[PDB]
Design a protein around this ligand. Sequence first.
Ligand SMILES: [Cl-]
Ligand SMILES: [Cl-]
Ligand SMILES: [Cl-]
Ligand SMILES: [Cl-]
Ligand code: NA
Ligand code: NA
Ligand code: NA
Ligand code: NA
Lengths: 174, 174, 174, 174
Amino acid sequence: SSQIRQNYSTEVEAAVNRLVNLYLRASYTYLSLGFYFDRDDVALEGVCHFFRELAEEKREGAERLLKMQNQRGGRALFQDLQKPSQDEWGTTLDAMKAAIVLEKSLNQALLDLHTLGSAQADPHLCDFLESHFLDEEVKLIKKMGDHLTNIQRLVGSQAGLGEYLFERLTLKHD
Amino acid sequence: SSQIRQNYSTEVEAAVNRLVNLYLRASYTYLSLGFYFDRDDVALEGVCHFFRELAEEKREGAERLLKMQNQRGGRALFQDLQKPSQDEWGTTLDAMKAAIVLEKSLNQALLDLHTLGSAQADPHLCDFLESHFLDEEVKLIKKMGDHLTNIQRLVGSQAGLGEYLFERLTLKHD
Amino acid sequence: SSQIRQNYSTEVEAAVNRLVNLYLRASYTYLSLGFYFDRDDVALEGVCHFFRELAEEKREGAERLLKMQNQRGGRALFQDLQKPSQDEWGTTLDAMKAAIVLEKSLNQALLDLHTLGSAQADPHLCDFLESHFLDEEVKLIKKMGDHLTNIQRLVGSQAGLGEYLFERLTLKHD
Amino acid sequence: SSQIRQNYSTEVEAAVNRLVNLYLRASYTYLSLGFYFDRDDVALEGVCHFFRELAEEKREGAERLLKMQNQRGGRALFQDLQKPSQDEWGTTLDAMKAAIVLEKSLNQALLDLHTLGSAQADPHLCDFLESHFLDEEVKLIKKMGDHLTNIQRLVGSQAGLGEYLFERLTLKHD
Ligand SMILES: [Cl-]
Ligand SMILES: [Cl-]
Ligand SMILES: [Cl-]
Ligand SMILES: [Cl-]
Ligand code: NA
Ligand code: NA
Ligand code: NA
Ligand code: NA
């Protein structure tokens, strides 16, 4: 059982398990986005790489949460991972909009857990989120917003040209 | 407008713009202090360098605030920068006293913004200040207090000798 | 007071202080331009970097003037720094037009100070401006004019595409 | 005679020869100052080195003038070098005062030659002085003024202590 647990509420323990589920769901969503942009009839390598890198990032955030759960003496509990919301993700613009929606949902879940931690007087939890999650999320949302603006600027009357150019000249590819 | 802004109050946005103004005013004050100590009739190179380095530090703090404003989806708004409070800054002791007064005013503005952020349940803001500003300010005020004590010890009956020695043996020069 | 001052008119001393104010105002204008292009709803990194680099250049020109003021035995006097003329800067084309207007105003202030120096038979002042300011300004205005022409060529019927391409393929970014 | 001389007035030629004499006189004055501070009953090594370095600098300025005279097709004419104004130079403060008097006299001779060159429409002469002499002189006078202020600050009630400290902690020695 637990010889180490101290100042770690059941409420936080459960909310940490839920947040793990959210991050793993987000990782799965990004795996799907990545492989969609690798289709031969989509073929935007930079976009594929962007989302594959995010899949890895979100899995790593879940892993950090799970490590912390054990450091505090809580017990990891895993639930089913729901499949992503779509099977096909449309244009790069559609995809980047869906991504920022997903990130704002994760960000709100971080803020909600921070609020709970604050209410439970759990400063280690609050510090953990501040130190490893909140700014990383703000930076990522800023990046996505920058991308959305550039994608939107490029639609013009020539959407295919713009989608190609964005992939070639903004996103990282081989 | 804003596709990214989340949990970022208008109150904090405005107070961040005011704090930018305060840091840029402080930078300007230190530019003036630096060039005063470079006058041929003042000629304390170490003192000049101390204050020139602080001008740069304060500008860099303003720049970090402005970067954060954009990361959060707020809008930078610039106001006039008032000129420094003095044209001539007296002795090294007078200057270092004015500097610690200025730093305590910046520190209180940091604390006030932290309080606002706390009241607005904005943990990213609170973390940002804690991580990049509050300890830097405490360390700087401690340094200035150490300097004031050594300057004061050196006045004795021989103020010019003491002011020379402090500049030569404590402050960094070529 | 002054044990060093020689052949340095009160008229030049005052005009040097005014020119410092102009360069610091220009630096502030460029800080504002830079952060505007870093907004998530503007998001032109190359444009942001261009103007941030100019902010630094103009501050450095002010610092050189202030160093010279002290070398000559004049007294630096600082005035309020008025806020930039706009809070939002429009398109890259609008911004680059505003920049060349600002540079031509600085250039005329340089020429005016040169004329004063000439009239005061102050060859050190005249040399100083020729050696550190006049050609730097001519080169910068030429660069801006080259940029304006390329920006203008790119508007065509597809303004967003052109603004993206200019930022990606002419301006320096990561 | 002269196959090369072009746009080089007899007035400038003669004034260049006079300026050579002035620089060589100044060099001789600094040789005397240097050896005075090397006396066993004066013994301020840093002060000795300061003035010995200036002797070399002034000789080098004379040599540059003589090189230029020949480049223009004028004829070097040498006159007697009057001995320095004093045999003993008093305190470091007395010496540094005499040095700034001497430098302001050289500086005025530079400005006077510039005026003549301007009146003779001799832009190569004017450029030569601006490029190799006027700023070097301004920088040197600023340095001397900085030194005088520090020396003066150190007199206090304890002149010998202050003169030692200045030599040890400001001036370059082994
Ligand atoms: Cl489902
Ligand atoms: Cl004011
Ligand atoms: Cl204004
Ligand atoms: Cl004689
Ligand atoms: Na909270
Ligand atoms: Na607080
Ligand atoms: Na002119
Ligand atoms: Na002249």
